[PDB]
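Hello again,

I reread your note about wanting to compare the complex against the isolated chains. To keep things tidy I'm splitting this into two emails, and this first one only covers the full assembly. Below are the input lines as submitted, including protein chains and any nucleic acid or small-molecule components. They are followed by the predicted structure of everything together. The single-chain runs will come separately.
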Amino acid sequence: KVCEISGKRPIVANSIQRRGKAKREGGVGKKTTGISKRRQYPNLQKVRVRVAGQEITFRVAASHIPKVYELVERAKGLKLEGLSPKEIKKELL
Amino acid sequence: VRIKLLLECTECKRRNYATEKNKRNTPNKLELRKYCPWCRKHTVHREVKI
Amino acid sequence: PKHGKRYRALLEKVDPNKVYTIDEAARLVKELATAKFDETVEVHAKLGIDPRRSDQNVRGTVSLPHGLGKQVRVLAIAKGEKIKEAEEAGADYVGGEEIIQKILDGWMDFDAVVATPDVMGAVGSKLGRILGPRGLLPNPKAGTVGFNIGEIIREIKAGRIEFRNDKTGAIHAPVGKASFPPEKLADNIRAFIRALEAHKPEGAKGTFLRSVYVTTTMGPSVRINPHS
RNA sequence: AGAGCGCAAGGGUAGAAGGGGGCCUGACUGCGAGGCCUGCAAGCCGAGCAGGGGCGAAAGCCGGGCCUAGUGAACCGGUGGU
RNA sequence: CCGGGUGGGGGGGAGGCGCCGGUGAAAUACCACCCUGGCGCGGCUGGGGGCCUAACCCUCGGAUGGGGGGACAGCGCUUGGC
RNA sequence: GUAAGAGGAGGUAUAGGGAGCGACGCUUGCCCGGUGCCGGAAGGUCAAGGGGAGGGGUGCAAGCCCCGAACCGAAGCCCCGG
RNA sequence: GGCUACGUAGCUCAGUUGGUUAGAGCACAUCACUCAUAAUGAUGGGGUCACAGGUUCGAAUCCCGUCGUAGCCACCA
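Full-complex prediction:
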């Protein structure tokens, strides 16, 4: 999907595993010639951290969790009261 | 056919070339035939490589 | 008691974690010979060539730019005319084709043999069960096939050295003679290094200069930076 | 000349191409006059020239085999050199 | 390898051993390295097992939690097969 | 169904799904050689991977980039039998 | 191509880190034992250890060189 931190959304088609077959040199070539096309899309995960007055979940990138706990850190700096789940969660950043 | 195969002689005294054929099956141990190189007159020549 | 008393003192001199190099080896390992007489510097040299490789076990034929001084006497079976050459060199009873039985009919006192290529054939066939096998007969590169192998009689009198691989390259350089001090030791060992790098295989990976152990003959030895 | 002349046969040959010995290594290098052939392309023939080499007393022959079959342009890449 | 070797504890004591000779491929105190197989550790590097829960998955009258599984599963990326 | 989830099924191995023959009565024989399929903590070849002996370009050097051995890396196919 | 295992008596099969003294059952052989075949026992012929090479004083017992046999990966302008 789309990570709720620094974007990071899927990649298609001429994104890749291609198959290919490629070329190099191992005779007349590794296998010489050879070629094809495919597909590839990012990681995401879950961080349901407490923080402040209530509980809140997160859809985090494959290397952006420290940024989440940092978001927690900045969050503490202000006033976080009232029963407001994603509403507080959004107010954060 | 490879049995007669194909091999190439080269002069001693650094490189030089001339193209030939063999016959490993026939009593063909090693060859050191006498020919002429690009540089200078007729000299030595040794057999090497495929 | 295990390695003797002498070697326990001469154990507290090794500190089995050292190098010395041809320098400190020449000097301190000159010292390391307090047992008897002329201990042979035994440069014990080990590398890696798969203890046969059909034809990769050196041969190394060296006189070490100084001199051993022991004996071989050569004996030789140098077909009359060749005898004459050996007659000016160091060769006891050069017997062209008849002292063969003063080797084969059990009468030792010799080494090397030098002989000739001619008799090589002949005399190689008769004694190829003691001399050759155990170490003497020709080995057409051990200073034992030729007439210019009498100049080599001189070379052997000054020192043959035989370097072979056996099971570990191993070879024992034999000078030192515990009567040579720093000088002769230095230049002898360095010379052996030169011959070591003279005879090399045709594609043997690994370390063509691990084990050096330059032991006199009775004691410590720990390497020489196997290079310097 | 029905023998042989590697292999199929044709053509050819004992005024040698056949078979015996001696020295060798011209299955040479840089070029190729001018012709065979022909849709192109590829194939076929070779004088002479110059470098040096082998045999020959010499005159001289030699750029593989008596010839016609034994072959695959190019694109790609291996390998040694310039 | 059933023949001795290798090691320690001790009695006790001024006495005990190595070459050639002999045999065979080789001569056997001692010294140098290495190999064979082994054993203990140190540098690197893996296979396999148990437990805990706090990742993550489930579930129970609101559950901040209780109970189960648990670093497997689920998932992202890359690897080769089918 | 890319997916959330959906049915299966708020059913639980006398139940849910896939194939052959087709009530019922008699009955269903040999072949594991090829192949599908079950299983198996020795092993053969191989992926990325781990690793780093060894090589090279270059800078005075410190350094950086690239090549890469021994040997340890699965699924699988070979393998062993049902 | 790369790496693996193997190829020894007419038949099929062991001896494999040496060193000795190269086997086993079938089969061929003249006998032996049974009154009688067969059962089994004995003596011989057949190895030229996939071929050479090299290590060793001394390999079928190890490295190396060629092939046949097979197996997986993997190459083919």
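For quick reference: Residues 18 and 37 of chain A are 4 Å apart (CA to CA).

B.
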